[PDB]
Design a protein around this ligand. Structure first.
Ligand SMILES: [Mg+2]
Ligand SMILES: [Mg+2]
Ligand SMILES: [Mg+2]
Ligand SMILES: [Mg+2]
Ligand SMILES: [Mg+2]
Ligand SMILES: [Mg+2]
Ligand SMILES: [Mg+2]
Ligand SMILES: [Mg+2]
Ligand SMILES: [Mg+2]
Ligand SMILES: [Mg+2]
Ligand SMILES: [Mg+2]
Ligand SMILES: [Mg+2]
Ligand SMILES: [Mg+2]
Ligand SMILES: [Mg+2]
Ligand SMILES: [Mg+2]
Ligand SMILES: [Mg+2]
Ligand SMILES: [Mg+2]
Ligand SMILES: [Mg+2]
Ligand SMILES: [Mg+2]
Ligand SMILES: [Mg+2]
Ligand SMILES: [Mg+2]
Ligand SMILES: [Mg+2]
Ligand SMILES: [Mg+2]
Ligand SMILES: [Mg+2]
Ligand SMILES: [Mg+2]
Ligand SMILES: [Mg+2]
Lengths: 324, 158, 123, 238, 392, 45, 101
RNA sequence: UUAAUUUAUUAAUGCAAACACCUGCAUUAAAAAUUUCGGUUGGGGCG
RNA sequence: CCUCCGCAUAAGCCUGCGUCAGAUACACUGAACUGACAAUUAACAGCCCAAUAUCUACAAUCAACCAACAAGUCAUUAUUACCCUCACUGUCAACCCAACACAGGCAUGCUCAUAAGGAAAGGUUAAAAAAAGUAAAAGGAACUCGGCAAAUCUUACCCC
RNA sequence: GCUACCUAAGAACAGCUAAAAGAGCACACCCGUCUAUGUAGCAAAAUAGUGGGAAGAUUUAUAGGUAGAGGCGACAAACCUA
RNA sequence: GCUAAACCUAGCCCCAAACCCACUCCACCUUACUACCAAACCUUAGCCAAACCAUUUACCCAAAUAAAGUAUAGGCGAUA
């Protein structure tokens, strides 16, 4: 029996809980110009206006019909355009809705009831994620900060069972998966593109009193996804709980509602999440994050209004970085 | 539905026996109703019709215990109502035929109120009476306004 | 094989367990892909008044005197609602029969949002 | 009982239709026919037994091309998919019918008897005397009912006055109007009778349940004894 | 022999009470009560219509009353349409001459070693291996997952040549695009409704491959006809239809010219998968449809010989077998069976790899066949690359 | 080995001995009527 | 409200309003450790999480972010002197997470 | 069952009725139904 | 020291070894006994779908060769209609069917020997008879209805 | 809800030999040849060993059907809640 | 002297008389106790008695009594 951890979660203050489970400290902030703008605007206008649809769309279906193909288009074209600049993107493997699985153990528990009452049992967690887009490479991105990096900010602690934040246990095949099998040469990961589900739209949160939880959703989706992704990568190199990683594992994520974009960088320093391994372990995983900013203010008939360049530049920046 | 002895001797085996009538589909015309009906009849009823001098006479003369047909009773009610109402629907724009028909069967004249209940089952009668006596409850506003008006009129007079 | 126990949503197999409920009123419908649609109007809306400066409190002072118990009747309601108006009309001026609508009577309930019979409102 | 026949389709299609096994039971649920139950699952292919069926807003003789000749689980004979105009249908294939073959369906009775090619369906009046025929109709435009088992052929014995005597495969003569349509030649899957089941398991696959273990005295009765003859029975040898 | 047994059919209504036919009186029914009763008569209820409009409980008007109903029948070719005659039927319907093999120009684009991807064989083998084996957690990925992904990855591999040819930056791939093209053939009204993803779009229209004299030579050619099958076979006969032309995009859309359409036969089951001939027919008709939509947008609703021909390419895939097509529309007057004719260069039954072994084949204790693709040939990918590199 | 004839199933139970099944036939209605007369707490499953 | 007939809704009909709500709520101390934001309630069976959100927002003017409900089975194990099972009532439990921290 | 008593049932036939079906009567078969299997003589066969 | 068991789902059962306080088929003054208190929180699962016509020949087996027979487990389109969202219910246990805390019956996934789960001996003595094993001089069926059992692992027939 | 048979839509079958099969050895699973134990028993039919089958006329879960003048039966007068 | 023994009254029985029952609210024929969608009438047989059994073998029908166990019926038997 393992807890199923959902990157895209309805659970309140899930960022803090995920920080505890993954041993992650969150730090705010990061660690052509005309052709790119044209292409981005083109993709938006194509998915919103230009492309003609036989059946009329609804607001429940708009995320899958409009936003998802937009993100696919953006990723594909921006990989193509920045390929001359970044040779690594040329050799890169691009994945559409490929599963990422991680399974780890973090903490212990004394079974409360039943025939196994009073017996120690490890807490197991499984992340199953379906990122919208994924870029995988044969070489590894360089570390943002050195291993054995010290952060004064401490990892949040929970005073109750994980079950309290709506987390549930189930028993199914344990999977460590990076988006492809181990035989695949593109074992290392570059950038992941996530689209928030329609359930976790901003409008619905505003309709509730979860105005503060907006950014939380984004952060949760980062901490859980990248930790999984990097985790898997680290496990593909033979590193595990007892035999901890020798070099840091880094990855980048772009999380979007379809209008608002948020940017995340993750460094994995520890797979030593078990109690026996965590007994004397100073190292901790790091997540850098940015507040969500709108790519565009609004879309009119055929013209985008209030297009923000800095957001596009930030997408470009993540796509640009290369292995040493 | 009865029993028989096997070879018309009481000493032989007793057996269940059913005697059924012979049935025929025949067409009959009612001049009172000016309609042709296809009905299942026996030879007995055909002979009964012949001796009564027509279907209409047969239906009207014959009481309920002899007819032993729900349809017969409904036909009877139909004809009695036609005769009671002096219904013009029998022969439109032909007064002479209508008058002659009604003159022929003037014997079986009955009040309309009586005619309406002829050949009804108890259940049908219960339903009919319930429908007849069912009215929406009167707003008590109307009752109270009326009684106060009469009271105030009485007060004004004295 | 427990006849006496109350039949509940806990009791049957998977289909059975999903189908039954605890008597909560529906607030929408299901559609393709087992998607649930909440209809806003179907959800009951609590009409909660402003209680600021409300002098009445949960209990009454014991110093308050006892009164004779008289339930409200139709006759009473009519006497101190409609009777003064119609009597005023009769004594001074003219009272028009079949024009009771001016005195607050309605021939039909169909027009109104709140219908007395049958009831179209909650509590 | 709760039995509902699977034969609900009202519109003809060439798509194989899911069919429900009976088990030899009725709507009532009791057995009427023994030795039926639980073979390989089968899908029904609807057969147009009316060979002369002119298309909608069409009349007169029409031609069709054989698309394929195919095994059918539901019958002994092979079936053929045939296309004409914008219509595809399943028919009963003849002994020598191949993909690419062109077959004619006519309602024309010829004064001079037309040459009888194997694939074609003609009225019996058109057909010469002594021609091997199959898929015959008892009544004009009724549909084929009579010679449709594998490797079966009827013989048009004689043609009198608007009437034709045919020999059914059981060597029984039948009177048929000349206007009735039959398909020339022998039905496909000749030497179907020559097949060897080989093991008990094969019949079980075909959906045939084993015969009762009860021993029966005789299929036919014993001859009833007349009044004077009884002394002539039960003679004992000494 | 009528279809549909009596028992399964809707049961006959119960016989009407004799009280109804007797004229004078009115029947006493259980209508007064709000429930059925055996002894009382069965009432006649007037037909009930819901006053308001309920989307969940909507009943459609009959087909006659539909505004778009027409006495004449239109014949729609869509994605699910599967032609009986295959290439034959497509050639007839589109009024086209068939030429075996790719045109020389397209092939020559890859003939040079310069216009090759670095480590071609290795990269293509990796693509096949990723799709067939490495894709998912499952041991053996199904066609529904591997067919789209193989094509996507191959396109991405082609995109890698952007640094050599800057013109490759002037193209996009479009998913969920639908185009409508209507025309007439021998007084038969035909419409192609092309639905599917992987439409490659360019700002620059493709150059015309065939010269004028070749187009003139197509006059001497005659459409080979098939009897007794009608060319309308396996097309949707539709009475309630709209006559409209659609490119699938609003006016002023960048990348408005269709370069290549990629069609995927991704069905898991063989019977659901189109036959290679049928897939070829689908390609011809889709390419024709896209080209005709383009032509009718540019030159209006006039039937005339096109001075500037429209060129659209197609790649039809099974995930293992590829068919390549270049279609040149040179005429929009299709009603007459005689005249100049459109041109189709079709290369068929071109397979990347013979088979793929997901798990190792072991007989006894010794491994016979290793994991990976068997019977791989690169020239098919060269053809794929050739079609991509066209117009660059 | 016997005695384990009862292999419980709520679907089977409700289908065979349920209220609706009882009311389906006149015999079943009389069954309910008998049980009502005896004053049974449990008329059906 | 409970033990009352809810007027049937038709598409484009008026909003359903309750003027005097019949159901009543008791705030209960948790038996197990909960997050600081979480408040436990015992709820009538007929009540929904939507109703509870609206209830708390309306009557008590407390901001509500999330509601989760469960149904607790009361023990029927207990027997009286007549060997007749005594039912402890089934009740509904609601967990409410407060908004604005 | 080749015991006795039946043909209520089914099927067919003939004669009435009715202008092929249904009904009444009779006949023939199948299928059953009800009931019994006295006493002496080792016990069993022939007596 | 054992593990031929375990963990989970399905089905079944329905609070049936959680906390506190009490009296008291081996016993602990403790029990699964009595009373009170507490608890299973949805993402998993259940609970689905506007209408009328219309479409659907080509198995599965790594689906590629090859070979079939018993012939197969999953496809739409055209037109009309359509804009509100995350409700309700299952979630506990040492558990079910066998009158029992019964050497029995009990579907599936994963673990194929365990990371999970358990204890054959209340204490003693070392009688007979009884049961299950282990070893046995010389002989090797002499036993017996019969090589039954055990050991050993075997030929050639006859009848059906 | 056992069982006999059927219907609908499902599931299971390791390893080794085999020109490849209602094939052989052999797990799981199904059955019950022979012996011993047990005989108010663990058990109103079980246990241990030894056995027969174990890709099929196979085994098995779910839902449905056939009802006593009857059903169902690879006839044992078998099974139809000990 | 243990186990025990002892008790009087819940209630019931037969009559008489009199013609009984029937909504707090909500839920309840679908898997009852679940807010909310496209069809009933139809001879009882048999045990039993006849010392077997085969025709037959009392069974309420409009209010006591008496006619009278009479006339009658019936393997003219049992019996009715
Ligand atoms: Mg068959
Ligand atoms: Mg035999
Ligand atoms: Mg029992
Ligand atoms: Mg069972
Ligand atoms: Mg819940
Ligand atoms: Mg307790
Ligand atoms: Mg779900
Ligand atoms: Mg252990
Ligand atoms: Mg012990
Ligand atoms: Mg001892
Ligand atoms: Mg001893
Ligand atoms: Mg020895
Ligand atoms: Mg011897
Ligand atoms: Mg020897
Ligand atoms: Mg001896
Ligand atoms: Mg032995
Ligand atoms: Mg030994
Ligand atoms: Mg079946
Ligand atoms: Mg095997
Ligand atoms: Mg075998
Ligand atoms: Mg074997
Ligand atoms: Mg059997
Ligand atoms: Mg025998
Ligand atoms: Mg015997
Ligand atoms: Mg029994
Ligand atoms: Mg006697």
């Amino acid at each position: 029996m393992k807890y199923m951890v959902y990157p895209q979660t309805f659970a309140l203050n899930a960022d803090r809980w995920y920080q505890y489970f993954t041993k992650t400290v969150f730090l705010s902030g990061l660690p052509d110009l005309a052709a790119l703008r044209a292409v981005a605007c083109d993709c938006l206008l194509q998915e919103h206006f230009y492309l003609r649809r036989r059946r009329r769309v609804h607001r429940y279906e708009e995320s899958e019909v409009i936003s998802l193909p937009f993100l696919d288009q953006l990723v594909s074209t921006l990989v193509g355009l920045l390929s001359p600049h970044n040779p690594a993107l040329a050799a890169a493997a691009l994945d559409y809705r490929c599963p990422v699985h991680f399974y780890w153990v973090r903490g212990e528990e004394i079974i409360p009831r039943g025939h196994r009452r009073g017996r120690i049992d490890d807490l197991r967690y499984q992340i199953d994620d379906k990122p919208n887009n994924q870029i995988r490479i044969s070489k590894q991105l360089a570390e943002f900060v050195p291993l054995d990096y010290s952060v004064p900010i401490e990892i949040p602690t929970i005073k109750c069972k994980p079950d309290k934040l709506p987390l549930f246990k189930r028993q199914y095949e344990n999977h460590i998966f990076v988006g492809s099998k181990t035989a695949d040469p593109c074992c290392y990961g570059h950038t992941q593109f996530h689209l928030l589900p329609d359930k976790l739209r901003r409008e619905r949160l505003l309709r509730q009193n979860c105005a503060d939880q907006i950014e939380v959703v984004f952060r949760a989706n980062a901490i859980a996804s990248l930790f999984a992704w990097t985790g898997a990568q680290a496990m593909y190199q033979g590193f595990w709980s007892e035999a901890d990683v020798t070099r840091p594992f880094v990855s980048q994520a772009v999380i979007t509602d379809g209008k608002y974009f948020s940017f995340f960088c993750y460094q994995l320093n520890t797979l030593a999440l078990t109690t026996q391994a965590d007994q004397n372990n100073p190292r901790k995983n790091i997540c850098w994050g940015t507040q969500s900013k709108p790519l565009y203010e609004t879309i009119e008939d055929n013209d985008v209004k209030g297009f923000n360049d800095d957001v596009l530049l930030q997408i470009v920046h993540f796509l640009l970085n290369r292995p040493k | 539905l009865g029993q028989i002895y096997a070879n018309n001797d009481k000493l032989s085996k007793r057996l269940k026996k059913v005697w059924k009538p012979q049935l025929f589909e025949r067409e009959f015309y009612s001049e009172i109703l000016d309609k042709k009906f296809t009905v299942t009849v026996t030879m007995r009823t055909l002979d009964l019709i012949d001796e009564a001098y027509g279907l209409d006479f047969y239906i009207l003369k014959t009481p309920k215990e002899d007819l032993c047909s729900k349809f017969g009773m409904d036909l009877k009610r139909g004809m009695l109502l036609r005769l009671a109402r002096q219904d013009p629907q029998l022969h439109p724009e032909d007064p002479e035929r209508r008058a002659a028909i009604y003159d022929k069967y003037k014997e079986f004249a009955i009040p309309e109120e009586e005619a309406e209940w002829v050949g009804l089952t108890l259940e049908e009668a219960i339903e009919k009476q319930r429908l007849l006596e069912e009215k929406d409850p009167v707003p008590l506003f109307k009752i109270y306004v009326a009684e106060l008006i009469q009271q105030l009129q009485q007060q004004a007079l004295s | 094989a427990d006849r006496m126990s109350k039949w509940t949503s806990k009791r049957g197999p998977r289909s059975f367990r999903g189908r039954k409920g605890r008597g909560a009123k529906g607030i929408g419908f299901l559609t393709s892909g087992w998607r649930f649609v909440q209809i806003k109007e179907m959800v009951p809306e609590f009409v909660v008044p402003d209680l600021t400066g409300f002098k009445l409190k949960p209990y009454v002072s014991y110093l308050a005197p006892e009164s004779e118990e008289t339930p409200l009747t139709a006759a009473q309601l009519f006497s101190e609602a409609v009777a003064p108006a119609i009597e005023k009309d009769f004594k001074d001026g003219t009272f028009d029969p079949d024009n009771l609508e001016k005195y607050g009577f309605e021939p039909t309930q169909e027009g109104k949002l709140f219908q007395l019979y049958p009831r179209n409102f909650l509590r | 009982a709760n039995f509902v026949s699977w034969k609900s389709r009202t519109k003809y299609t060439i798509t194989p239709v899911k069919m429900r096994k009976s088990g030899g039971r009725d709507h009532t649920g009791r057995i009427r026919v023994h030795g039926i139950g639980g073979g390989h699952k089968q899908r029904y292919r609807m057969i147009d037994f009316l060979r002369f069926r002119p298309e909608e807003t069409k009349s007169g003789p029409f031609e069709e091309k054989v698309i394929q000749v195919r095994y059918d689980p539901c019958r002994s004979a092979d079936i053929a998919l045939v296309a004409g105009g914008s219509r595809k249908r399943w028919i009963i294939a003849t002994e020598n019918m191949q993909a690419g073959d062109t077959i004619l369906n006519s309602n024309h009775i010829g004064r001079m008897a037309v040459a009888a090619r194997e694939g074609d369906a003609h009225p019996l009046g058109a057909l010469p005397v002594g021609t091997l025929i199959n898929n015959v109709e008892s009544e004009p435009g009724r549909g084929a009912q009579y010679i449709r088992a594998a490797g079966t052929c009827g013989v048009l014995l004689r043609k009198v006055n608007g009437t034709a005597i045919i020999q059914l495969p059981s060597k029984r003569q039948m009177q048929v109007l000349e206007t009735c349509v039959a398909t020339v030649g022998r039905v496909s899957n000749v030497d179907h009778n020559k097949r060897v089941i080989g093991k008990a398991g094969r019949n079980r696959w075909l959906g045939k349940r084993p015969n009762s273990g009860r021993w029966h005295r005789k299929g036919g009765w014993a001859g009833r004894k007349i009044r004077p003859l009884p002394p002539m029975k039960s003679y004992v040898k000494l | 022999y009528e279809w549909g047994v009596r028992s399964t059919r809707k049961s006959e209504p119960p016989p009407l009470d004799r009280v109804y036919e007797i004229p004078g009186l009115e029947p006493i029914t259980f209508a007064g009560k709000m429930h059925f009763v055996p002894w009382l008569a069965r009432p006649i209820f007037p037909p009930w219509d819901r006053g308001y409009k309920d989307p969940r409980f909507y009943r459609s008007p009959p087909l006659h009353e539909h505004p778009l109903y027409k006495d004449q029948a239109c014949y729609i070719f869509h994605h699910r349409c599967r032609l009986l005659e295959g290439v034959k039927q497509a050639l007839w319907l589109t009024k086209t001459k068939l030429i075996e093999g790719l045109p020389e120009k397209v092939l020559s684009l890859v003939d040079d070693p310069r216009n090759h991807i670095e480590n071609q064989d290795e990269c293509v083998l990796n693509v096949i291996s990723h799709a067939r084996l490495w894709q998912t957690t499952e041991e053996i990925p199904k066609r529904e997952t591997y067919c789209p992904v193989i094509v996507d990855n191959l396109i991405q591999l082609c995109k890698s040549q952007i640094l050599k040819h800057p013109s490759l930056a002037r193209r996009i791939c479009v998913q969920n695009s639908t185009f409508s093209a209507t025309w007439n053939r021998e007084s038969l009204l035909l419409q192609v409704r092309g639905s599917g993803g992987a439409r490659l779009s360019t700002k620059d229209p493709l150059p015309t491959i065939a010269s004028r004299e070749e187009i003139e030579a197509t006059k001497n050619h005659v459409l080979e006809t098939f009897y007794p099958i009608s060319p309308i076979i396996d097309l949707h006969e539709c009475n309630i239809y709209d006559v409209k032309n659609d490119t699938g995009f609003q006016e002023g859309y960048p990348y408005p010219y269709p370069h290549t359409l990629y069609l995927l036969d991704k069905a898991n089951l063989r019977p659901h998968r189109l036959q290679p001939d049928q897939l070829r027919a689908k390609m011809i008709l889709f390419a024709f449809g896209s080209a005709l939509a383009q032509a009718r947008l540019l030159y209006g609703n006039d039937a005339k010989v096109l001075e500037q021909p429209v060129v659209v390419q197609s790649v039809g895939t099974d995930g293992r077998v590829f068919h390549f097509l270049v279609f040149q529309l040179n005429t929009t007057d299709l009603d007459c069976n005689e005249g100049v004719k459109n041109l189709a260069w079709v290369d068929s039954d071109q397979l990347l790899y013979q088979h793929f072994w997901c798990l190792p084949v072991i007989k006894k204790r010794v491994v016979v066949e290793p994991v990976g693709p068997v019977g791989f040939k690169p020239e098919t990918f060269r053809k794929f690359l050739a079609l991509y590199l066209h117009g660059a | 080995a016997r005695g384990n004839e009862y292999q419980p199933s709520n679907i089977k139970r409700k289908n065979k001995h349920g209220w609706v099944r009882r009311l389906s036939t006149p015999a079943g209605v009389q069954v309910i009527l008998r049980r009502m007369l005896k004053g049974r707490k449990s008329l059906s499953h | 409200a409970r033990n009352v007939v809810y007027p049937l809704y038709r598409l484009g009909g008026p909003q359903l309003r309750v003027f005097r709500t019949n159901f009543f709520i008791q705030l209960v101390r948790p038996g197990v450790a909960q997050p600081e934001d979480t408040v436990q309630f015992r709820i009538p069976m007929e009540m929904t999480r939507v109703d509870l959100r609206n209830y708390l927002e309306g009557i008590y003017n407390v901001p509500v972010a999330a509601v989760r409900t469960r149904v607790q089975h009361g023990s029927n194990k207990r027997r009286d002197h007549r060997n007749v099972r005594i039912k402890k009532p089934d009740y509904k439990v609601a967990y409410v997470q407060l908004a604005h921290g």
